[PDB]
Design a protein around this ligand. Structure first.
Ligand code: A1CDO
Length: 330
């Protein structure tokens, strides 16, 4: 089998992407944030504290003839940005772009943190990291991809995120029309449960490429590109007036600037992030200070190749027995 679904930016900055997902019988369609940095499929629901729902579409398990309470199971997750959610668990039928999994764990939120409430466009998350990170207790549950894998034509999914435009998540096949050149594959460590890999270096604008190993994760659920402070300083030093602001929480730059590109290495290949992808707009409405899309990972403990990096590439998440990542230009 295969599946193919369009993913759409939630706003004009590409702060996140939402993909429609069918849950239950009859189908209830929710717009989920596909997150290769976590492993829980959770949704706003009829069980979510009413004061914490503000515009989201909710899953109502009592209206699904295929929903079954997963008795005794609970979940609780905290994300790198400080947000969190928790609740209980149902199993139900879940379909993405025509690909159906029966018996998928659908984690129903009883509580969500304020950042989720305040984002009316995101109805939940669909985790695509390794199932070893799934938070369901006492019986850990498998991701949608892990459940689908054996049925897929090939044990892969691909992320093709757009810049200020829709893109595509495919399951089970690699669309050879969706990229240019060849796909360069690179080794993955699953030891932390992430799609963790080592970039071979970087360049700023038209500058010379610096060969240096940068271990990080391919994370569709993170907006920005988080890299070591040395790399990030070298980038922003090429933008007149750019500075790290403790009050704002990262590098800012004059909105009048033209940003240089940023290149990262994948083996001997190179992915070029255009400068415009690094502009996240005014820090507050009407400000002439703009927020940068490349930020330091120093306070995080891991480098994160988030959407800013991934949207410059066609990305293959290869879930074969030895997983690997593939990157192509597009
Ligand atoms: C670090 N990324 C996590 C945190 C978050 C917040 C809003 C939407 C998605 C996600 C995944």
């Amino acid at each position: 089998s295969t599946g193919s679904a369009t993913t759409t930016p939630i706003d004009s900055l590409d702060d996140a992407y939402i993909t429609p997902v069918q849950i239950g019988t009859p189908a209830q369609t929710l717009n989920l944030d596909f997150d290769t940095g976590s492993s829980d499929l959770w949704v706003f629901s009829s069980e979510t504290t009413a004061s914490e729902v503000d515009g989201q579409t909710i899953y109502t398990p009592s209206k699904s003839t295929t929903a079954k309470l997963l008795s005794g199971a609970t979940w609780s997750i905290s994300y790198g940005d400080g947000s969190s959610s928790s609740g209980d668990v149902y199993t139900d039928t879940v379909s993405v772009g025509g690909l159906t999994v029966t018996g998928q764990a659908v984690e129903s939120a009883k509580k969500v943190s304020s950042s989720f409430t305040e984002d009316s466009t995101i109805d939940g998350l669909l985790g695509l990291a390794f199932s070893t990170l799934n938070t369901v207790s006492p019986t850990q549950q498998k991701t949608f991809f892990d459940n689908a894998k054996a049925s897929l034509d090939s044990p892969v999914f691909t992320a093709d995120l757009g810049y200020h435009a829709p893109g595509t998540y495919n399951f089970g096949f690699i669309d050879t029309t969706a990229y240019t050149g060849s796909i360069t594959y690179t080794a993955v460590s699953t030891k932390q449960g992430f799609w963790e890999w080592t970039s071979t270096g970087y360049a700023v604008g038209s500058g010379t490429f610096k060969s240096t190993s940068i271990d990080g994760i391919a994370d569709t659920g993170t907006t920005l590109l988080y890299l070591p402070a040395t790399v990030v300083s070298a980038y922003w030093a090429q933008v007149s007036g750019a500075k790290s602001s403790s009050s704002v929480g990262g590098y800012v730059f004059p909105c009048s600037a033209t940003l240089p590109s940023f290149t990262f290495g994948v083996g001997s290949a190179r992915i070029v992030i255009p400068g415009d992808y690094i502009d996240f707009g005014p820090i507050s409405t009407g400000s002439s200070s703009c927020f940068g899309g490349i930020q330091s990972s120093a306070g995080i403990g891991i480098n994160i190749f988030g959407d800013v990096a991934l949207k410059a590439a066609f990305v293959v998440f290869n879930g074969a027995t030895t997983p690997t990542l593939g990157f192509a230009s597009k």
